[PDB]
């Protein structure tokens, strides 16, 4: 009961709970799963300053999210009693939607039930509607913990705005800061932690963390992300993080100046 | 009657004469001539005695809060606003009660301006606008009349907001309930109009909205969390 699986049928029921834990547990650790990347943006070159964003935009506008995992915590890194992590499973149809071939195979290997997603998945616009007024976004006091998450927030913004992402990177951050005033990207923070390098699973091992749940799924990933933050905060940052130094900078993008895309 | 008359007229005078130019003056007048401890009461005065009745000055009173730049006060004002909206929403309603409905409308408009217009959400735990409409629909015409104009007024403030401006999914969720209520055959003339006007104010084509089948759920209508009396 540590990680609750959410589908269409029990979304309303679980939001009712999330609506409440956000009050006492204002640290939100997050990760998404999606069908990879399929394209490079036309007319943009790697040498461009904003090329990483333009590559993000290009694929997020084109592809559908498959899982969001939210793990709730507090100042001291404690969890609420019962479930601490929700894994939202979104409607996805391998006949109709687009995807990179490899990603579907990897996600399949990890335990994604693509047929259940097609049949009983959550609609993303309905999910936005409910997140909008839940205190989890737009409200001050909340703090988002992530890992190599440019694409993760791109999807969340695409979903919350019900629109394609802004043409210009500048604009994407402006609207991003409204929905998510305070973000800490563990992978960004790691650029100040001598001898911490690699993907989430690698960093988890160096920090001697114990992963609960299935690897390469959002819920479990978000919970591991959550653990990697609070463990890394005491060990490298003395249980405090400088907002001016680290808040809001997503790994690989133009804020806080190296690929934005979380390759395997 | 809420404050001893001396301290009362003292703050009455701050808002008595308010304008674009004397704005910053009046905000300093307030900051000095009034004690910090009375602010919760200054907040009631502002919501109940000014905002509730004179909708023409809501932009000014909003500018005031903006100039004052006090968040703990801005929080008081938001709770006062909700509290009064609750009183009215749980009052003994009657065809005759025109005044009460007028106050609710103005308090709706005001709520829009201090939340939506400022890219802040109307929280589900403070007010569930979608459920309010459906509950109004099952209780009767009377409740609808109290609630549709009020919801319209608060949404009017979505156009001025990069977040809630259409096609925001919450904003469009509400609009789609209204679009379904507009389809109802026996919905009073004045509320079909009120809903039409709201669409034009948000630069929406009523016909392009996507009405659902919520009003027919019945089982869902029977289990709403009541926000009306
Ligand atoms: Cl999507
Ligand atoms: Mg990830
Ligand atoms: Mg360009
Ligand atoms: Mg993952």
Residue numbers in the entry:
A (entry chain B): 10 to 266, 274 to 280
B (entry chain A): 1089 to 1317
From the study:
The final structural model includes all residues of the NOT1 MIF4G domain and residues Q10–S266 and G274–E280 of CAF1 (chain B). The buried interface is relatively small (712 Å2) and exhibits both shape and charge complementary. The interaction is mediated primarily by residues from loops L(α6–α7) and L(α8–α9) in NOT1 and by residues from α-helices α1, α5, α6 and α7 in CAF1. Most prominently, NOT1 residue P1257 (at the N-terminus of α-helix α9) functions as a central knob; it inserts into the CAF1 surface between α-helices α5 and α6 and contacts A137, M141 (α-helix α5) and the C-beta atom of N171 (after the end of α-helix α6). The MIF4G domain of NOT1 binds CAF1 opposite to its catalytic site, leaving the catalytic residues accessible to RNA substrates. In the structure of the NOT1-CAF1 complex, the C-terminal CAF1 fragment encompassing residues G274–E280 is visible in the electron density. This fragment includes three consecutive glutamates (E278–E280) and shields the active site of the enzyme.
The interaction between NOT1 and CAF1/POP2 connects the NOT module to the catalytic module and thus is central to the assembly of the CCR4–NOT complex. Given the crucial role of this interaction, we have solved the crystal structures of the isolated CAF1-binding domain of human NOT1 (residues 1093–1317) at 2.90 Å resolution and its complex with CAF1 (i.e. CNOT7) at 2.70 Å resolution. CAF1 (i.e. CNOT7) and POP2 (i.e. CNOT8) are one-domain proteins that adopt an RNase D-like fold.
